Amino acid sequence: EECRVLSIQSHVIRGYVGNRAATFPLQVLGFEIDAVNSVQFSNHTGYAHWKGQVLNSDELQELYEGLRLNNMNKYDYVLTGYTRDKSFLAMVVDIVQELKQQNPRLVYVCDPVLGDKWDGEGSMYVPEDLLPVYKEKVVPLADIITPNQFEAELLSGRKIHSQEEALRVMDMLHSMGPDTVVITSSDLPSPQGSNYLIVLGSQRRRNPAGSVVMERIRMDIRKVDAVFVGTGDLFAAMLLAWTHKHPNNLKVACEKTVSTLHHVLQRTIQCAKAQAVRPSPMQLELRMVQSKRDIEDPEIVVQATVL
Amino acid sequence: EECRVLSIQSHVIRGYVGNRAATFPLQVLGFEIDAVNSVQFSNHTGYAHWKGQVLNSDELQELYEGLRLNNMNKYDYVLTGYTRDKSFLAMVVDIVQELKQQNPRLVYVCDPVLGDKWDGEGSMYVPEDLLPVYKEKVVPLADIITPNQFEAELLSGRKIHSQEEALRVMDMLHSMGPDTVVITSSDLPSPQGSNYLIVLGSQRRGSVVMERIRMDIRKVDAVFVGTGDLFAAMLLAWTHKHPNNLKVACEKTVSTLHHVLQRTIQCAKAQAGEGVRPSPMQLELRMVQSKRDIEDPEIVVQATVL
Ligand SMILES: Nc1ncnc2c1ncn2[C@@H]1O[C@H](COP(=O)(O)OP(=O)(O)OP(=O)(O)O)[C@@H](O)[C@H]1O
Ligand SMILES: Nc1ncnc2c1ncn2[C@@H]1O[C@H](COP(=O)(O)OP(=O)(O)OP(=O)(O)O)[C@@H](O)[C@H]1O
Ligand SMILES: [Mg+2]
Ligand SMILES: [Mg+2]
Ligand code: NA
Ligand code: NA
């Protein structure tokens, strides 16, 4: 038995973002993940310097023809994240369409990377003309999506000020296409204090009996004093892995996903501090490799609230 | 404690060869390996088809520049394998010289891929103009080299017909520079039967001792791709953990390959059915499913000290 994933994301030489944050973890859990590298840079763009090349829609299509010609275009999952250009994204959409025709049971996990917000206001970090494509072509095709608060607000067109508006926006997202919507981070208020970020998740599904039900959860995570890159990619990847293992249990899938990132960042936070005192982007690269054990079976450190 | 490896080799979307065969195993064993993909192809060339793009020498330098500007050009090991381009390989050389000045203790593991021999006749599968660069530029720089028999013959200029000629040749290789030379496969005959392939290893290491070892590996009925790359990467990992113990390091390298292929050849057959010969697709290494065998391979081959 084998579960095949096609992950189209960026590659870097040094560090863990994109395909570099998604691949090792999924491989450790038994997945035959195939990495299509949308770009190859020396490191992520949060560093003072970075150089590299990008893959264009033509080349992505060639890579695909190669696979198709060998009749190797049969996947169980497809996984996308940061996509920098409309032309590429329209191509990723054509590829997902054909893979779904090839296999109707294919699950498309899509991280709709658009931007994020810093201390109150958010701004986009991909071309604005990608939003219409995400709205009309990509999300309708998705089975699981992992937007942060900023991205859900752009996808739904509604600002989110409360948990209830969050739920309403999540329902809106469900109606665009995906049965699983997880808001990966938000500045919603927590009763635990203000040094907490909020994760919300909602999954629609049919039970053996055949009724269409919805599981909803919330997690209040304590904030770590640092900026990490790649953890959004890691979140989407682990979510793929754990909903795959616990299909009818969003609570457990999310707790394992959020617990894995917690163990990775705790281990990362330790070494960052030891090597420094104000850690640079380099010292803050996720301690991926050293976290093998926590990825394989993470001790659950945060229980979710049931909504 | 961290050990960084810069691995420059090919990437495929489907399968395991190059950085694909070298990365996961080394990550599993705790290495901070950075993969520079010399190419990005849909799959390896053993298939009916393949499409893809290549990385040029200028792009390689660009990537290296980025790392340097950030003071990220400090590594414990460099690993390179199949390159089909002379300009690209010269750039790898300039890069390895550079990383060595930055860290004199850097260990360069070079798999000098030039070709192989099929039934007895060997044929190159890299342009000829590479050989001069390898003999004159690459090998003198290398600390560990992993050539198969054909490559050891091409690199030394001598034909190998016996275990003694082989070790004679490994010695010529040590003189070109490398302290550890391992011949990853040869047609030498084994006392165990015709169904065996021979691996020979030699390491030079205030005494100047010489350790030499041989292993008799049981041939498996099928042609795999990426096993040479896996061999070089696992050798780097094990030489790293058992430093002056060529014997143990080769034992774990080869045992690991054995489990992976045993596991691979089994699903191969399962998917091809009784009597039918597995395709390249079916024969792709079962990498991910061999995680446990990579972390701690059960030793199933003892090396003989020559
Ligand atoms: N500073 C932090 N402190 C604590 N946990 C964090 C921190 N940064 C990230 N995380 C963890 O990473 C997860 C996802 O957050 P992150 O902000 O990195 O991505 P995002 O903006 O939600 O996603 P994207 O833009 O990739 O779709 C959190 O929900 C949490 O589990
Ligand atoms: N058909 C096979 N049967 C049994 N073991 C094999 C077979 N093919 C490869 N191996 C294993 O793979 C290892 C390396 O062998 P392989 O022939 O693939 O590379 P090579 O020709 O020595 O290397 P390179 O071309 O990368 O310089 C062997 O030494 C052995 O452990
Ligand atoms: Mg964020
Ligand atoms: Mg061979
Ligand atoms: Na997200
Ligand atoms: Na070899």
Side-chain angles (χ1 to χ4, degrees):
Chain A
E1 197 57 9
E2 61 190 60
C3 179
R4 287 185 183 294
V5 182
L6 186 58
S7 180
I8 303 169
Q9 307 191 53
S10 39
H11 181 63
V12 294
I13 304 310
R14 178 61 142 264
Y16 307 81
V17 306
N19 254 158
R20 274 291 281 191
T23 309
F24 178 64
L26 291 169
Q27 284 181 313
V28 168
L29 296 168
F31 292 87
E32 283 285 358
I33 170 159
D34 293 340
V36 163
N37 301 318
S38 55
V39 330
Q40 172 154 58
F41 284 3
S42 48
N43 38 79
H44 71 60
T45 63
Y47 285 87
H49 316 271
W50 48 271
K51 310 287 304 185
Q53 309 73 41
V54 306
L55 188 72
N56 61 48
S57 21
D58 295 301
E59 300 164 326
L60 166 66
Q61 172 172 38
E62 233 206 308
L63 287 168
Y64 188 62
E65 191 76 7
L67 290 179
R68 173 186 149 293
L69 289 165
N70 282 311
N71 209 215
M72 321 188 294
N73 60 352
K74 293 175 173 55
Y75 286 82
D76 300 301
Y77 296 72
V78 170
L79 174 69
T80 65
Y82 171 86
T83 308
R84 49 165 294 274
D85 124 279
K86 178 185 183 172
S87 193
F88 202 82
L89 190 45
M91 188 34 106
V92 169
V93 170
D94 290 333
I95 289 160
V96 166
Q97 301 236 64
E98 196 177 297
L99 290 187
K100 279 187 162 188
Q101 285 178 20
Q102 286 287 342
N103 162 20
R105 290 164 302 97
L106 175 145
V107 170
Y108 174 21
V109 176
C110 158
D111 186 357
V113 179
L114 298 161
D116 204 331
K117 72 182 56 199
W118 233 88
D119 234 46
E121 193 50 78
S123 54
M124 285 187 50
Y125 39 66
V126 310
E128 296 184 347
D129 72 342
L130 243 53
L131 187 54
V133 179
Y134 268 117
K135 275 156 125 156
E136 314 162 13
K137 291 301 164 184
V138 186
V139 172
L141 255 188
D143 291 299
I144 297 172
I145 60 172
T146 67
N148 47 29
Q149 180 175 183
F150 182 75
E151 309 168 317
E153 292 177 338
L154 282 177
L155 291 173
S156 60
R158 285 198 189 287
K159 192 164 173 64
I160 282 156
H161 308 292
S162 52
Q163 177 178 92
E164 82 171 2
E165 300 182 57
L167 301 184
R168 182 204 245 97
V169 159
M170 292 185 259
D171 286 340
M172 209 157 340
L173 294 181
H174 281 305
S175 61
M176 287 155 76
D179 295 345
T180 307
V181 185
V182 179
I183 289 180
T184 57
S185 61
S186 70
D187 51 36
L188 290 182
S190 159
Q192 291 240 301
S194 57
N195 57 319
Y196 285 80
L197 68 99
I198 303 309
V199 170
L200 291 181
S202 140
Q203 182 171 255
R204 299 185 77 242
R205 81 212 170 212
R206 294 202 110 83
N207 50 209
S211 306
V212 170
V213 307
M214 176 178 269
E215 187 179 351
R216 256 177 200 162
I217 57 80
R218 184 204 171 114
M219 292 187 271
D220 290 65
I221 294 96
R222 189 185 51 68
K223 262 171 290 197
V224 160
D225 195 22
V227 166
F228 293 102
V229 187
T231 49
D233 307 316
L234 182 53
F235 191 108
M238 294 313 282
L239 181 67
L240 181 154
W242 298 124
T243 58
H244 171 85
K245 189 63 167 288
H246 307 286
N248 305 296
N249 191 332
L250 192 65
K251 184 179 177 301
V252 167
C254 285
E255 299 178 325
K256 275 183 172 171
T257 296
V258 163
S259 269
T260 291
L261 281 143
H262 163 87
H263 298 300
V264 177
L265 300 182
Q266 206 54 48
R267 185 177 283 102
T268 299
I269 260 314
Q270 306 302 183
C271 289
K273 280 174 176 176
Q275 312 164 57
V277 41
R278 195 63 192 156
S280 61
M282 200 180 84
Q283 312 163 302
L284 285 172
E285 285 289 349
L286 301 178
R287 285 294 180 183
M288 188 58 35
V289 147
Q290 303 85 357
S291 291
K292 186 173 64 175
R293 241 83 82 31
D294 301 311
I295 288 157
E296 286 172 337
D297 168 55
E299 188 209 333
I300 308 311
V301 294
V302 62
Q303 170 132 40
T305 295
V306 174
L307 296 176
Chain B
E1 168 62 13
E2 61 184 358
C3 187
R4 311 189 165 273
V5 182
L6 169 64
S7 171
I8 308 170
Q9 344 194 194
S10 55
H11 179 79
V12 284
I13 290 142
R14 179 71 144 248
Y16 302 89
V17 308
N19 265 323
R20 264 255 131 165
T23 309
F24 175 71
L26 275 171
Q27 286 174 317
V28 175
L29 297 166
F31 294 79
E32 282 294 348
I33 167 165
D34 300 347
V36 175
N37 305 304
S38 60
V39 320
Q40 165 156 52
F41 277 11
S42 70
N43 44 268
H44 75 233
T45 79
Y47 289 89
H49 316 255
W50 70 84
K51 292 248 164 310
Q53 296 83 40
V54 182
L55 185 73
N56 67 50
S57 56
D58 292 307
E59 298 173 321
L60 172 63
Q61 188 186 332
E62 193 164 20
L63 291 166
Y64 179 63
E65 246 301 74
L67 291 169
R68 193 176 32 190
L69 293 161
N70 280 303
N71 245 47
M72 278 168 353
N73 67 322
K74 281 77 150 48
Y75 290 95
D76 297 292
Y77 296 83
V78 171
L79 183 69
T80 70
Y82 183 81
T83 317
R84 198 181 185 300
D85 157 48
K86 174 189 169 190
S87 349
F88 194 90
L89 181 60
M91 185 74 240
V92 164
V93 171
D94 294 335
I95 289 166
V96 183
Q97 258 156 177
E98 266 272 333
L99 291 176
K100 285 195 146 199
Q101 298 170 190
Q102 187 91 138
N103 172 21
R105 315 261 294 165
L106 189 138
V107 170
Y108 173 23
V109 177
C110 162
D111 189 359
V113 184
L114 306 155
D116 214 323
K117 31 186 51 166
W118 219 136
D119 259 303
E121 60 164 0
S123 45
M124 291 188 98
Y125 37 58
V126 61
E128 282 177 9
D129 28 303
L130 272 274
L131 188 54
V133 197
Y134 267 119
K135 294 181 178 166
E136 303 157 17
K137 304 299 173 182
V138 193
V139 175
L141 252 199
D143 298 293
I144 295 186
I145 49 159
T146 59
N148 61 198
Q149 193 188 302
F150 187 74
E151 299 158 343
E153 296 177 328
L154 282 197
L155 292 174
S156 59
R158 303 206 172 307
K159 190 161 206 308
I160 305 195
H161 318 92
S162 69
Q163 176 177 290
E164 302 89 332
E165 306 214 317
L167 305 163
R168 218 71 77 27
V169 171
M170 287 163 62
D171 273 7
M172 296 190 56
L173 298 178
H174 286 296
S175 79
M176 299 186 42
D179 288 338
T180 303
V181 177
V182 175
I183 290 176
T184 56
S185 53
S186 70
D187 317 325
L188 298 185
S190 165
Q192 320 254 316
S194 55
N195 63 143
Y196 284 73
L197 93 99
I198 299 166
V199 162
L200 292 160
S202 177
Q203 177 174 282
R204 175 176 55 202
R205 62 165 182 271
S207 57
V208 46
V209 325
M210 211 66 206
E211 154 165 31
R212 293 184 216 261
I213 62 93
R214 103 119 84 166
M215 298 194 271
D216 289 85
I217 288 152
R218 24 298 178 66
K219 253 168 295 184
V220 164
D221 198 7
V223 155
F224 305 94
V225 184
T227 33
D229 305 322
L230 179 67
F231 189 110
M234 293 314 279
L235 182 68
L236 180 165
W238 296 119
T239 48
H240 179 75
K241 305 188 192 189
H242 306 298
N244 308 300
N245 205 326
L246 193 72
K247 185 175 174 299
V248 174
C250 286
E251 260 156 26
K252 295 193 163 172
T253 294
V254 161
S255 288
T256 294
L257 253 310
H258 174 79
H259 302 309
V260 172
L261 293 175
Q262 219 44 66
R263 182 168 291 100
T264 296
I265 203 54
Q266 266 142 62
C267 293
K269 296 171 174 184
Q271 305 177 302
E274 170 218 314
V276 192
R277 236 167 182 60
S279 51
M281 202 184 309
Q282 260 136 33
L283 288 171
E284 280 298 346
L285 300 181
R286 287 299 183 179
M287 201 54 83
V288 142
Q289 301 85 351
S290 300
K291 176 181 62 191
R292 283 275 205 57
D293 301 302
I294 289 158
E295 339 188 82
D296 195 44
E298 173 186 27
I299 303 318
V300 310
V301 166
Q302 284 262 65
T304 285
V305 176
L306 303 180

